[PDB]
Amino acid sequence: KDTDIQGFLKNEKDNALLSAIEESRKRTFGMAEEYHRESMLVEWEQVKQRIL
Amino acid sequence: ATPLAVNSAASLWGPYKDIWHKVGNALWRRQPEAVHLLDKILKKHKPDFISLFKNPPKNVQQHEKVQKASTEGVAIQGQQGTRLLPEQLIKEAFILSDLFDIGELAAVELLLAGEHQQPHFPGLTRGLVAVLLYWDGKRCIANSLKALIQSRRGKTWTLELSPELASMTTRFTDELMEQGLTYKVLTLVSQIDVNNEFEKLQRERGLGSEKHRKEVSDLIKECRQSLAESLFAWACQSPLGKEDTLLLIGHLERVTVEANGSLDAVNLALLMALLYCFDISFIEQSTEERDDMIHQLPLLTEKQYIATIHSRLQDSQLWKLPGLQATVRLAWALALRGISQLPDVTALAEFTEADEAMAELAIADNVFLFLMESVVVSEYFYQEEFYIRRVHNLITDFLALMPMKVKQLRNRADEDARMIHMSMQMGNEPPISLRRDLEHLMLLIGELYKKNPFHLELALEYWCPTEPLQTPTIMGSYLGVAHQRPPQRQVVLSKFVRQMGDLLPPTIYIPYLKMLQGLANGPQCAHYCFSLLKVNGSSHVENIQGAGGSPVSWEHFF
Amino acid sequence: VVNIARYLYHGNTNPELAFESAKILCCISCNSNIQIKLVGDFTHDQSISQKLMAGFVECLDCEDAEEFVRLEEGSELEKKLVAIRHETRIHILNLLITSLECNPPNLALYLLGFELKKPVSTTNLQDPGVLGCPRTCLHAILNILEKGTEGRTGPVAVRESPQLAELCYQVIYQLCACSDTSGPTMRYLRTSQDFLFSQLQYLPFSNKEYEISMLNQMSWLMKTASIELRVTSLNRQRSHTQRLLHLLLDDMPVKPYSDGEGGIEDENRSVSGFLHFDTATKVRRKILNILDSIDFSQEIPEPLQLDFFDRAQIEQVIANCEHKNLRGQTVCNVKLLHRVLVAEVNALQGMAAIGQRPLLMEEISTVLQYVVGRNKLLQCLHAKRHALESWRQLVEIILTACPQDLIQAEDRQLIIRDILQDVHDKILDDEAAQELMPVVAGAVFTLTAHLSQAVLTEQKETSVLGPAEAHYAFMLDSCFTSPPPEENPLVGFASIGDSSLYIILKKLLDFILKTGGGFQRVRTHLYGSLLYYLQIAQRPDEPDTLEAAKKTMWERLTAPEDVFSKLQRENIAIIESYGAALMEVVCRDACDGHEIGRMLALALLDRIVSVDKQQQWLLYLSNSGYLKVLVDSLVEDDRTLQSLLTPQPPLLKALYTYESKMAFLTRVAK
């Protein structure tokens, strides 16, 4: 309810705890694709001079 | 910052409760911030106390504005502008104006208070509530007056009030007594009657429900009572003046009992005020404040006080109640009996040589019967302690200071008992003109100490320890008070209880058992009475033919 | 029952009949089944109903105070009659309190003046006499708290009847927390009495006798003020929201109306003070001054010592007496405990027991006094915690429900930075009661989240001013005096470098260490707080522009450091300064802790291994073996994750903990 304060000041804290975990996880997992891509591009950024 | 301070003598309730609550916080709650308000409130409302319960008067220059209040309007304190008043409130204001003899703006400001307070009295009207507020406003003045008198310095109590507060209250209320306070109070207490005010209120329909009739009936009694008690609370702390005591006598001349035989709480308080104007017993008690307690007595400094009061009490004019005149005659005879035992007081001998004669008049007017049936039988006699203390003194000082009258009363009782015995041996009724002086005194003692609403064991003056109590259960002191001798008052009184047991005739027997019943009231009182009834039996050993043990003993009874 | 209730119409003339009447009616009002019928029999006859309403009000508006029961000068009979009248008020307030949590229609909604011939939420409450409105128990409960609201001393009942004031504030809380009373009540309390402003100005309340009751009075007044900040904000009633915010938040000394011509004397106070002109006297905010009056320490009564009774049995006889009172609180029934211990001091047939009986009653007296101490302790630990919960509720509505255009991006941050530092020290002190820690960490979490959210608006709305147009704006307002030096206008953003933010980091790590391993719900809030704090130190996502990719390796090494790169260095150096103790506390709770404990401690290790440039935490994680406990456990996670592939999975928790374990491993592996 809406005069109900303790249901609200519970739920937005369970939401805030999940949100603090969520950007840690999803920023680290996006940083997994980007780390393979930069590593692929940096070993390629060795190979073309081994070639040239 | 002007003008607005002009209406502020018309509202007949709000300013009076504003005084009463702040007198309550400054006195009974001792609150220090309220002292710096009380000084200013007493300086403001001194005119109101100088003319107790007096209305603001009617005025054509209010009457116009109330009749025009539907078109020109009225300005009211706390409100910005003029309020237009309905024809109803205008006509209600003229009804309250002629019902109470109040000014037309005061009837409006009282109806505006009655309109604001109406929701607290569900089922009444602002007019029926204005009838409450007009008597509660008077009650707030009367209770403030009583509390401002109880907070004087004086000879009977000290409410811990600061030496400044206790001199502010004293001085401010001396500055009301200057003004003939006793005359104003006795005028109000003899003009205010519930029946006359209910006749006014029933005609013009100012009586509501059965609760409202109870409320108005009691607010009018509180207005009589706190006024009469203002003279009692004065007289106990500081005695009334010469003409004031003659006005108080001049009122008591004219009293009548209620339909049961007792005084009302109001004329009881006025009797007790006159009795405290005649107390001197503290001069057998105080040693170091003593001489300033003596200068504070018209009974010692005004030879004129005694000369006028003694004259009006030796007077052959009977009062409406001869037993009330008898009670005041006994108190005056005992006041003279205290004064005749103070050393240098030779200057009053021409009045004190009458002490046993003023006592014979009090006995002849039948004082002890009126003290029983018109004073001690009242439920209001057992609602105040200083009433009980004063009727204790009025009997103990008769027994201690007039033991030659006590002997005259026994010489009579042991002969009117012989008249009753001889009539019954002749087969004839006892003659109606025999006098019950000692029977009435012993029944009065038996009906007095019979209740003790403040636990005081005052009957202990009628006892005296023959054996030491050995209660081992209090361990809190080291002051070895070596063997104090019992006081002469107690040594005469505890002798009187024993010597009215000497050879009891059958007429005094039941009065003596009742005298012992009243004096057996309290834990020690009962133990000393048990010990008397034991000692009265423990003498008849071996002599089982000489029938003559005490008929007031345990062994005779069982 | 109606003729029992008619004795209340005689409360001034027979208080001993009105007392037992109110008390019988309080016992019967406990029955929720009977409430609906009492409303019938009490309103079917309006002539009786007007006497019933009058009798309940007549007992409440009576003026007699708790003082006259203590003054030794008074008559036994007067002391008794004042105590009877005061119990008569208390049983009327208890009758109302129990009736208000019974479903409508109930006896309290009648006695308080609600329109029980409509839906309750459509009630048009008004002042007594207005349109012919009767005086009701609501206008009496207000009158009890209204007396003294002009005074420099505050409300009269808070001093002269503190138990009456506690119950009066509870009825006003129930009338504002229930949905269908709240609309009528939260209108009326503002339209006619301004009641929440005229009372909150007198916080905190203060007497050393009635601490428990004053903490409960303040608890209920903070819980009504809470609802009005939310209600005014949702209804966009800006001026009333803002006026209640100022009364709680300003660093300003609220001056009473200072009319003229009064002052002097008090030149008595100790001349030695004339050299301690202490400019440390900051005007601390009203909401902090209420946190000051909530004590966090606690008196623990000394452990019972006994010569005759076994304490290992007495502690069980005490536990068998620890029932729940009408406030839900566990308390020992002293009258049952006394009956039981006296029964054994009757059952001891012995020569010897009947010589020892005085000493057995004397040791019963010390046991009963210790149990009265235990009952004070439990009620004080309740009241401190209930007040801290009410204060926390008020703070969190100011943060979650009040508009951002009523507390600005710098003052909102200062208020949270100061509240965090004050809320920390009262739990970092070692006398501080552990029962408060679940409320304190539960507040520090919402505070650190709102500090992080405020910086996470400030960063983005400052990210608008291009350094090319300001040079024209400065060229008009031609005032003419004394020039300043060449100082640079970059002020508010420098506050991301405070000592306050480094103090808040330490105090949070100190409280993470101090919270013992049973306090797992306290630690999940504190690990959440440290994640939100480490989001203040978060660089945002920058755009992969074909122009940012032109910035050379020289520009990427000769630019000044941005404040987030600085703040990351100084925060990791603070985290390093706790070393192996903080490393054990986080790594162990990541392996072994609660479902949510492991989940958050793994996200905290992911965030720490995102800033550790020395590999100290990685070298701890490997040489402790915790980096293998967080790997061998994948073969035990799996069995739970298999169950989460069912169509209706029982609890997604184990997935969310696996995703943070795998995030931590996918941080370490870089």
Side-chain angles (χ1 to χ4, degrees), chain C residues 216-424:
Chain C
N216 296 332
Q217 289 164 13
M218 293 182 46
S219 287
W220 296 140
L221 182 57
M222 286 189 286
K223 274 173 174 134
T224 53
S226 287
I227 301 165
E228 198 61 272
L229 284 168
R230 193 175 190 202
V231 167
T232 54
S233 183
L234 290 171
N235 292 276
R236 301 183 176 186
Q237 301 179 309
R238 190 193 196 98
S239 48
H240 210 102
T241 316
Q242 184 172 352
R243 182 176 173 226
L244 291 177
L245 287 171
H246 283 306
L247 187 60
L248 293 172
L249 299 182
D250 304 345
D251 307 92
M252 272 290 293
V254 181
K255 295 179 182 178
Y257 288 94
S258 182
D259 205 356
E261 301 184 45
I264 318 175
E265 300 166 75
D266 187 17
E267 296 198 76
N268 246 265
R269 291 182 174 244
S270 297
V271 184
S272 311
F274 198 86
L275 305 159
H276 299 320
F277 211 107
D278 302 346
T279 55
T281 46
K282 296 181 181 181
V283 187
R284 198 192 210 161
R285 304 177 182 107
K286 189 74 142 180
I287 199 160
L288 297 176
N289 307 349
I290 293 162
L291 182 65
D292 291 319
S293 57
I294 297 165
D295 174 29
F296 280 43
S297 71
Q298 188 47 47
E299 316 166 298
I300 303 181
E302 285 199 88
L304 277 174
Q305 296 172 92
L306 302 172
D307 265 1
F308 304 104
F309 290 105
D310 176 15
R311 189 169 170 202
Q313 288 171 83
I314 277 185
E315 293 283 4
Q316 292 177 87
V317 180
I318 292 165
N320 296 343
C321 294
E322 281 192 53
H323 80 110
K324 287 182 179 177
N325 75 9
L326 300 176
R327 299 182 179 190
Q329 305 165 321
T330 43
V331 285
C332 180
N333 186 348
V334 191
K335 293 186 178 182
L336 182 61
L337 180 62
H338 181 222
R339 278 172 165 171
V340 172
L341 295 170
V342 169
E344 294 306 319
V345 184
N346 307 343
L348 291 170
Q349 297 179 24
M351 272 160 117
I354 301 166
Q356 291 171 254
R357 208 180 182 254
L359 304 176
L360 292 170
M361 290 289 185
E362 195 161 40
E363 191 166 281
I364 285 169
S365 90
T366 62
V367 172
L368 291 170
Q369 284 171 97
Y370 177 76
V371 170
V372 170
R374 185 173 176 144
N375 287 341
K376 183 199 170 201
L377 173 61
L378 291 168
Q379 288 172 77
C380 178
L381 286 173
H382 178 105
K384 289 174 170 180
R385 184 173 167 179
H386 194 137
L388 187 61
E389 171 60 10
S390 286
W391 175 91
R392 184 192 71 70
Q393 195 195 263
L394 184 65
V395 170
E396 285 177 26
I397 284 176
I398 292 168
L399 295 175
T400 58
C402 292
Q404 293 182 256
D405 55 323
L406 291 189
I407 320 173
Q408 327 173 110
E410 293 191 49
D411 38 284
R412 187 178 175 105
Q413 282 192 70
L414 292 172
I415 288 166
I416 298 163
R417 289 170 194 204
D418 301 336
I419 290 167
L420 278 167
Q421 289 171 104
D422 294 343
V423 169
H424 273 141

Side-chain angles (χ1 to χ4, degrees), chain B residues 115-121, chain C residues 57 61 125-140 142-143 146 188 192-193:
Chain B
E115 182 170 272
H116 194 109
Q117 299 296 315
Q118 204 185 315
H120 300 61
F121 300 96
Chain C
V57 172
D61 291 320
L125 295 179
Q126 284 183 332
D127 307 284
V130 181
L131 304 184
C133 186
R135 192 171 170 72
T136 80
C137 297
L138 179 57
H139 313 131
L142 292 171
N143 166 49
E146 181 184 324
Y188 181 56
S192 307
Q193 291 227 320

Side-chain angles (χ1 to χ4, degrees), chain B residues 28-78:
Chain B
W28 304 120
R29 300 177 164 186
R30 308 181 182 151
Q31 294 184 347
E33 293 190 89
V35 183
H36 273 290
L37 297 173
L38 182 68
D39 173 83
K40 300 166 190 151
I41 290 171
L42 294 183
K43 285 168 186 167
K44 178 189 172 214
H45 288 283
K46 197 168 176 180
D48 323 35
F49 285 107
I50 286 176
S51 61
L52 299 175
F53 300 4
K54 183 191 169 190
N55 302 330
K58 293 169 189 172
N59 181 351
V60 188
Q61 302 188 8
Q62 296 182 3
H63 205 108
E64 258 199 82
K65 299 174 188 140
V66 178
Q67 201 159 124
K68 295 156 133 205
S70 54
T71 55
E72 294 178 11
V74 175
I76 301 156
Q77 292 192 324

Side-chain angles (χ1 to χ4, degrees), chain C residues 90-147:
Chain C
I90 287 172
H91 292 307
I92 291 169
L93 296 185
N94 294 335
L95 173 163
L96 292 172
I97 285 167
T98 305
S99 298
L100 278 180
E101 293 183 44
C102 286
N103 293 291
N106 67 52
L107 182 64
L109 291 171
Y110 159 67
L111 291 177
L112 296 162
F114 290 77
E115 290 186 272
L116 301 183
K117 298 179 181 176
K118 300 180 177 169
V120 184
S121 27
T122 69
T123 295
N124 200 91
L125 295 179
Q126 284 183 332
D127 307 284
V130 181
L131 304 184
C133 186
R135 192 171 170 72
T136 80
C137 297
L138 179 57
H139 313 131
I141 285 170
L142 292 171
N143 166 49
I144 289 162
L145 298 176
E146 181 184 324
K147 287 181 190 189

Side-chain angles (χ1 to χ4, degrees), chain B residues 17 21 29-31 33 119-120 122 160 211 455, chain C residues 9 54 58 63 65 67 73 76 128-129 135 160:
Chain B
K17 190 170 180 179
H21 267 28
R29 300 177 164 186
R30 308 181 182 151
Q31 294 184 347
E33 293 190 89
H120 300 61
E160 303 199 283
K211 195 180 184 152
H455 311 299
Chain C
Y9 188 66
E58 180 174 338
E63 303 204 82
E67 308 164 301
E73 291 164 77
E76 292 186 281
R135 192 171 170 72
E160 298 179 2

Side-chain angles (χ1 to χ4, degrees), chain B residues 498-518:
Chain B
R498 296 172 194 236
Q499 293 220 256
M500 296 306 178
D502 306 350
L503 303 175
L504 273 164
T507 46
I508 304 176
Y509 189 77
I510 293 176
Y512 188 84
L513 292 175
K514 287 183 174 185
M515 190 193 75
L516 288 188
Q517 190 186 13

Side-chain angles (χ1 to χ4, degrees), chain B residues 82-188:
Chain B
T82 50
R83 181 177 165 177
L84 293 172
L85 304 179
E87 275 217 316
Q88 294 172 335
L89 197 162
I90 294 171
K91 291 164 190 179
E92 290 162 61
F94 293 126
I95 291 163
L96 279 161
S97 183
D98 295 333
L99 178 58
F100 293 146
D101 206 46
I102 61 175
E104 300 89 342
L105 184 66
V108 169
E109 289 185 6
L110 182 68
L111 274 167
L112 291 166
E115 182 170 272
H116 194 109
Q117 299 296 315
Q118 204 185 315
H120 300 61
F121 300 96
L124 304 194
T125 65
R126 62 177 176 232
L128 291 171
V129 179
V131 172
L132 294 173
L133 300 184
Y134 180 65
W135 289 109
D136 186 56
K138 289 172 183 178
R139 182 175 70 153
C140 289
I141 298 168
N143 293 357
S144 300
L145 180 67
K146 192 174 70 191
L148 289 167
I149 291 166
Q150 289 172 285
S151 56
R152 294 171 63 71
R153 300 186 187 206
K155 305 186 190 182
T156 48
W157 57 77
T158 41
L159 305 174
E160 303 199 283
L161 304 180
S162 86
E164 299 180 283
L165 178 57
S167 56
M168 187 195 302
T169 52
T170 304
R171 182 192 66 232
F172 175 79
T173 69
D174 308 318
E175 298 180 304
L176 298 178
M177 189 59 80
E178 281 188 320
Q179 317 286 292
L181 183 61
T182 320
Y183 179 78
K184 294 164 181 172
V185 172
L186 293 174
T187 299
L188 290 172

